[PDB]
C-alpha cells in the first residue's frame, strides 16, 4: 500500500528537505522501470549483443549497457536534483547543465552483471548518492568522496521479480515493482542482515591467485574445524544478485584482491561503495580485508577496490584471518 | 515473428500427428505465463513463504510451489493430451480422468530453485514428455520410462526474462515470453552447445563429501596442468538457471553423488532426464559419472540421480577421471 | 478459470471435429492481443494517422487499419485452418497457399470504428467464419455465402477492457483479455439479449435522408404514444461498440438505407453478417428492414447492407412500421 | 520522451512554486494507473455490479465507483498537497488531517460514465484543482469557488488507450499511459480546439423535454438552412469520452437543462467546471446557455449545472438561439 515515492517523501519531510531527493529517486525509478521492461523482453527487442566499444575499465560494452546508461543519465538530468554524474560507461564525470542542476552527485552502474545478460541470469543497476559539499562549480572532484559521505544508495535487481533496494540514514527498505501499475511497492521494511549466515559467495576459479587469507577462509567454510555443517556455496555472477541474497539470507560475498589484481575487480564508486552502504545500514560489514570500504578516499572515479561484505560475524571471521596473516 | 504454437504445429505436421502435442504445449505455456506473472510480483502478492507441508523428497513446500503445481496440473488435465502426470509436489502419479485423457505422460518440476525464491534469484519449471506405450489402463508405471524415450522436454526459466526452452527430436529452440501480448516468440533456433566451455558449475560447499574424481576435476579447473586459463566458476543455485547458462555459454554443470548421497540430490524423472534430453539434443552430454542419465530405467517416480552435463569435451574429461579412479 | 482455447476445444470435441476451428480461433486471438496492445499505446507508438491509401469502400485507410490487417492475415494463414480470406482492406479475396490451406473461409473487418480511432473511443475487430462447401479450388465465390451459413462469428472489442465475443451454433460467450497473462478468460456464458430494451442507437445526423419508417420509429422512441418513458439514445460511432452494448443492455442499433444510400453503409460480409449472427444466437434479430440479413446471398465481397438489430420486440416494432409504409 | 511528471515540474518551476502541484499530480497519476489496470480487467476481477448504496445525486453506486473513489482519496491524502477533497461519491467534503494537509482543494469524479461501465464503453476520472484562498481552517466552503478560480483541471480517459488530459494556465496537454512502464507520456502539446466542428453530441432521447433553443439547434444541425452538410451525431454516453472527442475533433457537446431538470444533470464542481476549464484553455467555450459555467458561484458541492461546450463558433451559434428565444 506504500509506494517508494510516498516513503521517500515522508522520510524527507522528517529530515526537513526541499524535496529533490524525492525528485531524484522518482526519476531514477522511471529509468529503472524502463530498463526492467526492456530486460524482460530483451531477446524479442534484439537487445543482446555488443555495442562495439570498451569502457575505461576495459569491459566490452553491451547493448543493454548503452540503453540503461542513456536512460539513467537522461532521467537524472531532467530530475533537477543532480549536478555531477559518474557512470561506469562514461570516461569522465558528466556535469549537468546549469539550468537543470541540482545539489546531488550520483555515481551509478547502469547495468551490473554484464557476463550474465545473455544467459538471462539476474542483472541490475547500482547507485550511490552524495550531497555536493563544495561551493565552487561542479566537477569530477565532487564525486571523489569516501562512501561514508553517502546520503542514499541502493540498487534495482532485475531478477525473478524487479526489486528496488534503498538505503538511507535510517535504514534499508525493499520495494517491488508492480508490473501492472508501474509502481514500486514497499515489501520489506527496515531490513537487517543476520549476524551470521551459512552461505559463502566467491568465484573460486581464481583459487590459483587468492591470497593466503581468502584461501584459508574458504577451506574453513568447507571443512569447519568444529565439525559444524559446511557453508553452502552460491555465486550467481552478478554482484547485485549475490549481494541481494547476502542481504536477505545472510552470509558473505567476496571479490577480494588477488595476485593479478591488487585492488580486486569491482569498482569503488558505483559498485563497492553503494553495496557497502546498504550493508552497513542493514547491520552488516564491508571491508577490503584491511580497511572499511566506506572510508576509502577515492582518487579515480573508476578505481577498483577489493570487497568482502555480509553478516558481521562472517566478515569479522575473515578479517581475523587477514590480521593473523599480517 | 514465430510463436511457440506455430513452431510446434508445423513441426508436428511434419511428423504426421493428431495435434495433441501442440495442445499439450499450448496448455503448458498458459500455466507458464501464469507462473511468470505471479513470480514477477510475488512479493506484492504475498507469495513468499512456506506452505506448511513437506514432499516425498523431504523439501519444505513453498507457496509458489503449490501455486505452480496447481496451475500445471489443471492446464495439462484440460489439455486433453495427457493420461499420467508426475510432479515433484505429488506423492503418487496423477491419473487423468477418462474423459480428458490423452496419449502423453508428463513428468514435471512445477517450480525449480526453491532455495532461490526468496532472494529473487532465477527459478523455473521443468518438464519431460513421454508417449504412453502400454495398452492397458494408465498407471504410475507409465512414467517409469528411461529418459531416452522422451519425445519432448524443456523448461521455463523465470530469469531476467522468461524463456521457454523446448527440445524435441529435431533439436532445441528457445522462445521468449513477450509480456505485452502473452506469447512465446522464437528467439534462438536449433541451439547447439559449444564443444568445450570455460565455466564449471557446482556447489563446492560439499567438498568434504565429494568423491576423488569430482575433487580432481575441480582442482584441474582451478590449476590447469597445461597453464591454460583456469575456468570461471558460476553456481546460481537453481538447476534451471545453471543448466540454461551451460546450454548457451557452454561449460559443465555438476550435482554428483557424494559420501552422503549415493544418488545425488536432483530427481531423475522431472529434473535430470528433461535436462539430459535438452543437453543431448543440443549436442551435449549428461552422465551420472558412470552411465548416461537418459538410459537409466527408473523404479521410483521420485528417485534421485547424480548428474554431470554440458559441453561434450568437458563432460568427457570428467568421465575419463571417473574411469581412471575406477 | 476457463480460457477461450479450452472452451472452443471442448465445444469442438462435442461436435466431433479435427480441431482446426480451435487452431483458427487460437490464431485469431493472438492477432487480437497484438492489436489490443498496439491500440492501448497507439499514441506512444505513433500509430494514429492515415496510411496513404483508400480501400474499395472508399474509406481513407489508417495506420491501425494496415497493422491490424497484416496481423490478422498472417495469423490466419499460419493457422493451417483457412483457404479464403476476405478483408475490408483488401480489394480481392486472399487465397491461402496450398501448403497452409485449411477448410475455413474467413471474412473480417481488421479494425472497426475508423472515425473513432483518434479520439480514443472504442474500436474493434469483426469476423465471420464459413466452412468451404465447394470441392473445386478455393476462390472468392467461397466467401459469397449467405450469413446463415456461418459456423462461427464474433468480434474483439477494444474498449475500457478488451473483450472477445464469440458466437457459434450453441450460443454466444464473452471472454475478457487478461493483460497480465495474455489469455482470454470466459466471463459471460450463454449470453442472451433482453426481449425489449430502452436504448436506440442511430446517427440522427442523417435525419434529412431517413425513410418514413425510420423517421416514425425515432419519433416514437422520443414521444411514446402510451406515455411510457422515452428511450435513451446512445451512438458511440463504432459498430462493434454500439452492437456490443445492444447485446448486453438490450435495445436497438440502426444503420438503415437512406435516400443517399440504397444499401446503407455497413458491409455485409464482415460487418453486418457477423453481428447479425451474434444477435440471432443471442435471441435477437437482424434485418435490413425488409429481409433477414443472414439470408441475403451476396454477389460482391464488399457489398453494403442496411442493418437494424437488437432486442426482438424492438426490431419487430420497427419491422411493423416498414410493413405499414409498404 | 517527456513524462507528465517532468512536464508539470518544469511548468511549475517557471511559475515559481514549492512543488506540491507536481506532488499532487504525481499522486493522482498513481491512482489513475491503478484504476486503469482494474478497468482493463474488471470482468476478470469481478468488478462489475452495484456496491449497494446511492450517493447524494441519487446514482446507484457501482463497484468501480468505490474502488476508484478509495484510490483517489488515499493518494491525494498521502500527497501532502491537499486540504479539502470533494467527490461525487462522498456526501460531504473530506478534510485532510493536519499532518498531511496541503494547500490545494480537489474536486473529483472518481469514475465518470457509470451507465457505460458494464458494456465496456469508455469511462474516466475527472478532476478540478483549486488553491485554498482563506486563512482559516479548511472546510467545505473552500471547495465552493467559481470554476474561473481553477489552477489545474483535467481527466483520465479509459478508452481504447488511457489518456490523461491536463489543463493549466498556459494550456492543455495530453499524456498517454504507457502500460509497459506505467508512465504518462506527452503525446499532444498545447492542444487547441477547432473553431467550428461538424459533430453534435446530445442524448436526443430527451427531445420531449428540451427547451425551444436546443430543439431549434438540433433541427438546424440536421437540416442546415444553407444546404451545407448536416452535422454527424455522436453520443458515447460518458461525459469524459464525448468531451474528449469534442476537444480533439471539434464540434459541440450538450447536456442542457430541460423541462424536468432546471439545472441539467451533470455536476458543477467535478464534471462541468473541470471540462469547462479544459475547453476554455483549448480555445473553446462552455456555457449553461445563459452564463459561462466557470463564472457560476456554487452553493452546493453537489449542485448540477446545464452545460454546452466545444468549438467557439458552434457554442456561439447555440447561444444566439437562446438569446433569440429570450
Ligand atoms: O566473472 P567474475 O570475475 O567472477 O566477475 C563477476 C563480477 O563482474 C561484474 O559483472 C562486474 O564486471 C559483477 O557484477 C560481478 O560480481
Ligand atoms: O543447495 P544445493 O545443495 O546446491 O542444491 C541446489 C539444487 O536444489 C534444487 O533447488 C533442487 O532442490 C535445484 O534447483 C538446485 O540445483
Ligand atoms: O459516421 P457514421 O456514418 O455514423 O458511420 C459510423 C459507422 O462507420 C463505421 O466505422 C464503418 O465505416 C462503423 O464502425 C460505424 O458504425
Ligand atoms: O444517460 P444520460 O441522461 O444521457 O446521461 C449521460 C451522462 O451521465 C453521466 O454518467 C453522469 O451521471 C455522464 O458521464 C454522462 O454524460
Ligand atoms: Zn562492465
Ligand atoms: Zn557492475
Ligand atoms: Zn555495469
Ligand atoms: Zn523441491
Ligand atoms: Zn527442481
Ligand atoms: Zn520444484
Ligand atoms: Zn473502413
Ligand atoms: Zn467496420
Ligand atoms: Zn474496418
Ligand atoms: Zn454517478
Ligand atoms: Zn461523472
Ligand atoms: Zn462518477
PDB file of N, CA, C and O in Angstrom, chain C residues 107-155:
ATOM      1  N   UNK C 107     -14.153 -13.969 -43.217  1.00  0.00           N
ATOM      2  CA  UNK C 107     -14.419 -12.611 -43.661  1.00  0.00           C
ATOM      3  C   UNK C 107     -14.192 -11.764 -42.427  1.00  0.00           C
ATOM      4  O   UNK C 107     -14.776 -12.041 -41.379  1.00  0.00           O
ATOM      5  N   UNK C 108     -13.350 -10.746 -42.530  1.00  0.00           N
ATOM      6  CA  UNK C 108     -13.103  -9.913 -41.365  1.00  0.00           C
ATOM      7  C   UNK C 108     -12.913  -8.434 -41.644  1.00  0.00           C
ATOM      8  O   UNK C 108     -12.569  -8.017 -42.752  1.00  0.00           O
ATOM      9  N   UNK C 109     -13.147  -7.657 -40.593  1.00  0.00           N
ATOM     10  CA  UNK C 109     -13.003  -6.207 -40.575  1.00  0.00           C
ATOM     11  C   UNK C 109     -11.869  -6.104 -39.559  1.00  0.00           C
ATOM     12  O   UNK C 109     -12.097  -6.217 -38.355  1.00  0.00           O
ATOM     13  N   UNK C 110     -10.621  -5.919 -40.035  1.00  0.00           N
ATOM     14  CA  UNK C 110      -9.469  -5.829 -39.131  1.00  0.00           C
ATOM     15  C   UNK C 110      -9.573  -4.777 -38.037  1.00  0.00           C
ATOM     16  O   UNK C 110      -9.195  -5.029 -36.895  1.00  0.00           O
ATOM     17  N   UNK C 111     -10.076  -3.602 -38.384  1.00  0.00           N
ATOM     18  CA  UNK C 111     -10.232  -2.549 -37.399  1.00  0.00           C
ATOM     19  C   UNK C 111     -11.526  -1.804 -37.670  1.00  0.00           C
ATOM     20  O   UNK C 111     -11.621  -1.056 -38.642  1.00  0.00           O
ATOM     21  N   UNK C 112     -12.527  -2.019 -36.820  1.00  0.00           N
ATOM     22  CA  UNK C 112     -13.808  -1.343 -36.991  1.00  0.00           C
ATOM     23  C   UNK C 112     -13.925  -0.112 -36.096  1.00  0.00           C
ATOM     24  O   UNK C 112     -13.517  -0.141 -34.927  1.00  0.00           O
ATOM     25  N   UNK C 113     -14.488   0.961 -36.653  1.00  0.00           N
ATOM     26  CA  UNK C 113     -14.663   2.203 -35.916  1.00  0.00           C
ATOM     27  C   UNK C 113     -13.594   3.224 -36.271  1.00  0.00           C
ATOM     28  O   UNK C 113     -13.106   3.957 -35.417  1.00  0.00           O
ATOM     29  N   UNK C 114     -13.243   3.270 -37.550  1.00  0.00           N
ATOM     30  CA  UNK C 114     -12.207   4.169 -38.063  1.00  0.00           C
ATOM     31  C   UNK C 114     -12.263   5.612 -37.583  1.00  0.00           C
ATOM     32  O   UNK C 114     -11.247   6.180 -37.172  1.00  0.00           O
ATOM     33  N   UNK C 115     -13.448   6.205 -37.648  1.00  0.00           N
ATOM     34  CA  UNK C 115     -13.616   7.597 -37.255  1.00  0.00           C
ATOM     35  C   UNK C 115     -13.401   7.827 -35.763  1.00  0.00           C
ATOM     36  O   UNK C 115     -13.231   8.965 -35.327  1.00  0.00           O
ATOM     37  N   UNK C 116     -13.411   6.747 -34.986  1.00  0.00           N
ATOM     38  CA  UNK C 116     -13.224   6.844 -33.541  1.00  0.00           C
ATOM     39  C   UNK C 116     -11.805   6.552 -33.059  1.00  0.00           C
ATOM     40  O   UNK C 116     -11.511   6.667 -31.869  1.00  0.00           O
ATOM     41  N   UNK C 117     -10.920   6.173 -33.971  1.00  0.00           N
ATOM     42  CA  UNK C 117      -9.554   5.869 -33.577  1.00  0.00           C
ATOM     43  C   UNK C 117      -8.856   7.018 -32.853  1.00  0.00           C
ATOM     44  O   UNK C 117      -8.447   6.885 -31.696  1.00  0.00           O
ATOM     45  N   UNK C 118      -8.741   8.152 -33.533  1.00  0.00           N
ATOM     46  CA  UNK C 118      -8.038   9.308 -32.988  1.00  0.00           C
ATOM     47  C   UNK C 118      -8.588   9.967 -31.733  1.00  0.00           C
ATOM     48  O   UNK C 118      -7.843  10.663 -31.034  1.00  0.00           O
ATOM     49  N   UNK C 119      -9.871   9.775 -31.440  1.00  0.00           N
ATOM     50  CA  UNK C 119     -10.435  10.356 -30.224  1.00  0.00           C
ATOM     51  C   UNK C 119     -10.474   9.313 -29.101  1.00  0.00           C
ATOM     52  O   UNK C 119     -11.127   9.514 -28.081  1.00  0.00           O
ATOM     53  N   UNK C 120      -9.763   8.205 -29.308  1.00  0.00           N
ATOM     54  CA  UNK C 120      -9.657   7.124 -28.326  1.00  0.00           C
ATOM     55  C   UNK C 120     -10.963   6.456 -27.911  1.00  0.00           C
ATOM     56  O   UNK C 120     -11.062   5.898 -26.815  1.00  0.00           O
ATOM     57  N   UNK C 121     -11.964   6.506 -28.776  1.00  0.00           N
ATOM     58  CA  UNK C 121     -13.230   5.858 -28.465  1.00  0.00           C
ATOM     59  C   UNK C 121     -13.096   4.397 -28.885  1.00  0.00           C
ATOM     60  O   UNK C 121     -12.237   4.056 -29.700  1.00  0.00           O
ATOM     61  N   UNK C 122     -13.923   3.531 -28.302  1.00  0.00           N
ATOM     62  CA  UNK C 122     -13.868   2.105 -28.599  1.00  0.00           C
ATOM     63  C   UNK C 122     -13.829   1.748 -30.077  1.00  0.00           C
ATOM     64  O   UNK C 122     -14.555   2.319 -30.888  1.00  0.00           O
ATOM     65  N   UNK C 123     -12.970   0.790 -30.407  1.00  0.00           N
ATOM     66  CA  UNK C 123     -12.850   0.280 -31.766  1.00  0.00           C
ATOM     67  C   UNK C 123     -12.770  -1.235 -31.609  1.00  0.00           C
ATOM     68  O   UNK C 123     -12.826  -1.742 -30.487  1.00  0.00           O
ATOM     69  N   UNK C 124     -12.642  -1.967 -32.706  1.00  0.00           N
ATOM     70  CA  UNK C 124     -12.587  -3.412 -32.572  1.00  0.00           C
ATOM     71  C   UNK C 124     -12.225  -4.146 -33.840  1.00  0.00           C
ATOM     72  O   UNK C 124     -11.696  -3.553 -34.775  1.00  0.00           O
ATOM     73  N   UNK C 125     -12.517  -5.443 -33.855  1.00  0.00           N
ATOM     74  CA  UNK C 125     -12.233  -6.316 -34.990  1.00  0.00           C
ATOM     75  C   UNK C 125     -13.428  -7.262 -35.121  1.00  0.00           C
ATOM     76  O   UNK C 125     -13.856  -7.859 -34.132  1.00  0.00           O
ATOM     77  N   UNK C 126     -13.958  -7.395 -36.334  1.00  0.00           N
ATOM     78  CA  UNK C 126     -15.123  -8.241 -36.580  1.00  0.00           C
ATOM     79  C   UNK C 126     -14.790  -9.396 -37.528  1.00  0.00           C
ATOM     80  O   UNK C 126     -14.069  -9.215 -38.508  1.00  0.00           O
ATOM     81  N   UNK C 127     -15.324 -10.580 -37.243  1.00  0.00           N
ATOM     82  CA  UNK C 127     -15.049 -11.727 -38.100  1.00  0.00           C
ATOM     83  C   UNK C 127     -16.227 -12.685 -38.265  1.00  0.00           C
ATOM     84  O   UNK C 127     -17.063 -12.838 -37.375  1.00  0.00           O
ATOM     85  N   UNK C 128     -16.274 -13.321 -39.430  1.00  0.00           N
ATOM     86  CA  UNK C 128     -17.311 -14.287 -39.729  1.00  0.00           C
ATOM     87  C   UNK C 128     -16.587 -15.471 -40.336  1.00  0.00           C
ATOM     88  O   UNK C 128     -15.739 -15.293 -41.215  1.00  0.00           O
ATOM     89  N   UNK C 129     -16.909 -16.674 -39.874  1.00  0.00           N
ATOM     90  CA  UNK C 129     -16.250 -17.873 -40.373  1.00  0.00           C
ATOM     91  C   UNK C 129     -17.215 -18.844 -41.038  1.00  0.00           C
ATOM     92  O   UNK C 129     -18.263 -19.175 -40.484  1.00  0.00           O
ATOM     93  N   UNK C 130     -16.837 -19.293 -42.232  1.00  0.00           N
ATOM     94  CA  UNK C 130     -17.623 -20.238 -43.017  1.00  0.00           C
ATOM     95  C   UNK C 130     -16.787 -21.477 -43.295  1.00  0.00           C
ATOM     96  O   UNK C 130     -15.559 -21.443 -43.219  1.00  0.00           O
ATOM     97  N   UNK C 131     -17.469 -22.563 -43.631  1.00  0.00           N
ATOM     98  CA  UNK C 131     -16.817 -23.816 -43.965  1.00  0.00           C
ATOM     99  C   UNK C 131     -16.881 -23.874 -45.489  1.00  0.00           C
ATOM    100  O   UNK C 131     -17.937 -23.620 -46.073  1.00  0.00           O
ATOM    101  N   UNK C 132     -15.761 -24.172 -46.138  1.00  0.00           N
ATOM    102  CA  UNK C 132     -15.762 -24.253 -47.593  1.00  0.00           C
ATOM    103  C   UNK C 132     -16.664 -25.415 -47.999  1.00  0.00           C
ATOM    104  O   UNK C 132     -16.479 -26.546 -47.545  1.00  0.00           O
ATOM    105  N   UNK C 133     -17.644 -25.128 -48.849  1.00  0.00           N
ATOM    106  CA  UNK C 133     -18.586 -26.145 -49.302  1.00  0.00           C
ATOM    107  C   UNK C 133     -18.143 -26.809 -50.603  1.00  0.00           C
ATOM    108  O   UNK C 133     -18.156 -28.037 -50.724  1.00  0.00           O
ATOM    109  N   UNK C 134     -17.751 -25.988 -51.573  1.00  0.00           N
ATOM    110  CA  UNK C 134     -17.307 -26.476 -52.872  1.00  0.00           C
ATOM    111  C   UNK C 134     -16.239 -27.560 -52.756  1.00  0.00           C
ATOM    112  O   UNK C 134     -15.688 -27.799 -51.679  1.00  0.00           O
ATOM    113  N   UNK C 135     -15.959 -28.214 -53.880  1.00  0.00           N
ATOM    114  CA  UNK C 135     -14.956 -29.272 -53.943  1.00  0.00           C
ATOM    115  C   UNK C 135     -13.804 -28.798 -54.823  1.00  0.00           C
ATOM    116  O   UNK C 135     -12.703 -29.348 -54.780  1.00  0.00           O
ATOM    117  N   UNK C 136     -14.078 -27.773 -55.622  1.00  0.00           N
ATOM    118  CA  UNK C 136     -13.087 -27.198 -56.522  1.00  0.00           C
ATOM    119  C   UNK C 136     -12.106 -26.315 -55.758  1.00  0.00           C
ATOM    120  O   UNK C 136     -12.248 -26.113 -54.551  1.00  0.00           O
ATOM    121  N   UNK C 137     -11.112 -25.791 -56.467  1.00  0.00           N
ATOM    122  CA  UNK C 137     -10.113 -24.932 -55.850  1.00  0.00           C
ATOM    123  C   UNK C 137     -10.754 -23.710 -55.197  1.00  0.00           C
ATOM    124  O   UNK C 137     -11.767 -23.194 -55.673  1.00  0.00           O
ATOM    125  N   UNK C 138     -10.164 -23.231 -54.092  1.00  0.00           N
ATOM    126  CA  UNK C 138     -10.660 -22.067 -53.351  1.00  0.00           C
ATOM    127  C   UNK C 138     -10.648 -20.773 -54.162  1.00  0.00           C
ATOM    128  O   UNK C 138      -9.662 -20.453 -54.827  1.00  0.00           O
ATOM    129  N   UNK C 139     -11.753 -20.035 -54.102  1.00  0.00           N
ATOM    130  CA  UNK C 139     -11.874 -18.774 -54.824  1.00  0.00           C
ATOM    131  C   UNK C 139     -12.770 -17.805 -54.058  1.00  0.00           C
ATOM    132  O   UNK C 139     -13.351 -18.160 -53.034  1.00  0.00           O
ATOM    133  N   UNK C 140     -12.880 -16.585 -54.572  1.00  0.00           N
ATOM    134  CA  UNK C 140     -13.691 -15.545 -53.954  1.00  0.00           C
ATOM    135  C   UNK C 140     -15.140 -15.983 -53.761  1.00  0.00           C
ATOM    136  O   UNK C 140     -15.792 -15.588 -52.797  1.00  0.00           O
ATOM    137  N   UNK C 141     -15.636 -16.807 -54.680  1.00  0.00           N
ATOM    138  CA  UNK C 141     -17.010 -17.301 -54.624  1.00  0.00           C
ATOM    139  C   UNK C 141     -17.287 -18.037 -53.318  1.00  0.00           C
ATOM    140  O   UNK C 141     -18.423 -18.079 -52.840  1.00  0.00           O
ATOM    141  N   UNK C 142     -16.242 -18.623 -52.744  1.00  0.00           N
ATOM    142  CA  UNK C 142     -16.376 -19.357 -51.494  1.00  0.00           C
ATOM    143  C   UNK C 142     -16.754 -18.453 -50.325  1.00  0.00           C
ATOM    144  O   UNK C 142     -17.245 -18.927 -49.298  1.00  0.00           O
ATOM    145  N   UNK C 143     -16.531 -17.151 -50.487  1.00  0.00           N
ATOM    146  CA  UNK C 143     -16.860 -16.182 -49.445  1.00  0.00           C
ATOM    147  C   UNK C 143     -18.229 -15.553 -49.688  1.00  0.00           C
ATOM    148  O   UNK C 143     -18.750 -14.843 -48.831  1.00  0.00           O
ATOM    149  N   UNK C 144     -18.806 -15.808 -50.859  1.00  0.00           N
ATOM    150  CA  UNK C 144     -20.116 -15.257 -51.197  1.00  0.00           C
ATOM    151  C   UNK C 144     -21.247 -16.175 -50.742  1.00  0.00           C
ATOM    152  O   UNK C 144     -22.086 -16.599 -51.540  1.00  0.00           O
ATOM    153  N   UNK C 145     -21.258 -16.484 -49.451  1.00  0.00           N
ATOM    154  CA  UNK C 145     -22.285 -17.338 -48.876  1.00  0.00           C
ATOM    155  C   UNK C 145     -23.196 -16.492 -48.001  1.00  0.00           C
ATOM    156  O   UNK C 145     -22.769 -15.473 -47.453  1.00  0.00           O
ATOM    157  N   UNK C 146     -24.472 -16.887 -47.872  1.00  0.00           N
ATOM    158  CA  UNK C 146     -25.391 -16.120 -47.031  1.00  0.00           C
ATOM    159  C   UNK C 146     -24.950 -16.299 -45.579  1.00  0.00           C
ATOM    160  O   UNK C 146     -24.413 -17.347 -45.220  1.00  0.00           O
ATOM    161  N   UNK C 147     -25.179 -15.285 -44.753  1.00  0.00           N
ATOM    162  CA  UNK C 147     -24.775 -15.360 -43.359  1.00  0.00           C
ATOM    163  C   UNK C 147     -25.296 -16.548 -42.571  1.00  0.00           C
ATOM    164  O   UNK C 147     -24.671 -16.973 -41.596  1.00  0.00           O
ATOM    165  N   UNK C 148     -26.434 -17.098 -42.981  1.00  0.00           N
ATOM    166  CA  UNK C 148     -26.998 -18.230 -42.260  1.00  0.00           C
ATOM    167  C   UNK C 148     -26.107 -19.467 -42.375  1.00  0.00           C
ATOM    168  O   UNK C 148     -26.342 -20.473 -41.705  1.00  0.00           O
ATOM    169  N   UNK C 149     -25.078 -19.385 -43.215  1.00  0.00           N
ATOM    170  CA  UNK C 149     -24.143 -20.496 -43.394  1.00  0.00           C
ATOM    171  C   UNK C 149     -22.945 -20.389 -42.447  1.00  0.00           C
ATOM    172  O   UNK C 149     -22.082 -21.265 -42.422  1.00  0.00           O
ATOM    173  N   UNK C 150     -22.895 -19.317 -41.668  1.00  0.00           N
ATOM    174  CA  UNK C 150     -21.799 -19.114 -40.723  1.00  0.00           C
ATOM    175  C   UNK C 150     -21.749 -20.220 -39.671  1.00  0.00           C
ATOM    176  O   UNK C 150     -22.785 -20.692 -39.208  1.00  0.00           O
ATOM    177  N   UNK C 151     -20.540 -20.630 -39.300  1.00  0.00           N
ATOM    178  CA  UNK C 151     -20.372 -21.655 -38.275  1.00  0.00           C
ATOM    179  C   UNK C 151     -19.812 -20.995 -37.015  1.00  0.00           C
ATOM    180  O   UNK C 151     -19.845 -21.564 -35.928  1.00  0.00           O
ATOM    181  N   UNK C 152     -19.297 -19.784 -37.178  1.00  0.00           N
ATOM    182  CA  UNK C 152     -18.745 -19.029 -36.060  1.00  0.00           C
ATOM    183  C   UNK C 152     -18.607 -17.578 -36.485  1.00  0.00           C
ATOM    184  O   UNK C 152     -18.357 -17.286 -37.652  1.00  0.00           O
ATOM    185  N   UNK C 153     -18.783 -16.673 -35.532  1.00  0.00           N
ATOM    186  CA  UNK C 153     -18.677 -15.248 -35.803  1.00  0.00           C
ATOM    187  C   UNK C 153     -18.551 -14.511 -34.488  1.00  0.00           C
ATOM    188  O   UNK C 153     -18.947 -15.012 -33.437  1.00  0.00           O
ATOM    189  N   UNK C 154     -17.995 -13.314 -34.543  1.00  0.00           N
ATOM    190  CA  UNK C 154     -17.846 -12.560 -33.325  1.00  0.00           C
ATOM    191  C   UNK C 154     -17.007 -11.335 -33.551  1.00  0.00           C
ATOM    192  O   UNK C 154     -16.823 -10.884 -34.681  1.00  0.00           O
ATOM    193  N   UNK C 155     -16.478 -10.801 -32.467  1.00  0.00           N
ATOM    194  CA  UNK C 155     -15.680  -9.606 -32.568  1.00  0.00           C
ATOM    195  C   UNK C 155     -14.839  -9.417 -31.333  1.00  0.00           C
ATOM    196  O   UNK C 155     -15.113  -9.996 -30.281  1.00  0.00           O
TER     197      UNK C 155
END
